[PDB]
Amino acid sequence: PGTPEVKVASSEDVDLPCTAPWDPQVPYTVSWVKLLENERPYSLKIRNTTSSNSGTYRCTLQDPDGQRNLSGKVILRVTGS
Numbered sequence: 001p002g003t004p005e006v007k008v009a010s011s012e013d014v015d016l017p018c019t020a021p022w023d024p025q026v027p028y029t030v031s032w033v034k035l036l037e038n039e040r041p042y043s044l045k046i047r048n049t050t051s052s053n054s055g056t057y058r059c060t061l062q063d064p065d066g067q068r069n070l071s072g073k074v075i076l077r078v079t080g081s
Contacts, residue, residue: 003056003073008049009080018042018059019072028061028070035073046076054078 008014015038022028022042030042035056038045042061046053053076060071 003075005075005077007077007079010050010078011048011080013045013047014049014076015040015043015045016057016059016074016076018044018061019074020059020061020070021072022061022070027064029064031060031062033058033060049076049078051078 004017004019006014006016016032017040018030020042028042032044035058042059044057044059056073056075058071058073060069062069
């Protein structure tokens, strides 16, 4: 609900977008997780996608001062064959 979705055919590559509402002119570092229980900045590259890559992912951007971070979620659905 409210979470954007990326659909990709199996065996294709995908750059999963970071959906955190980040600040321009801030040099973030990015860390990605999968929640179990290309000219766009901060995307997660997933090569040769398979059915098991489907799920919900979370991107976290860390401000260089180490005092703030921002997170956003995105769903991946792998299809085709």
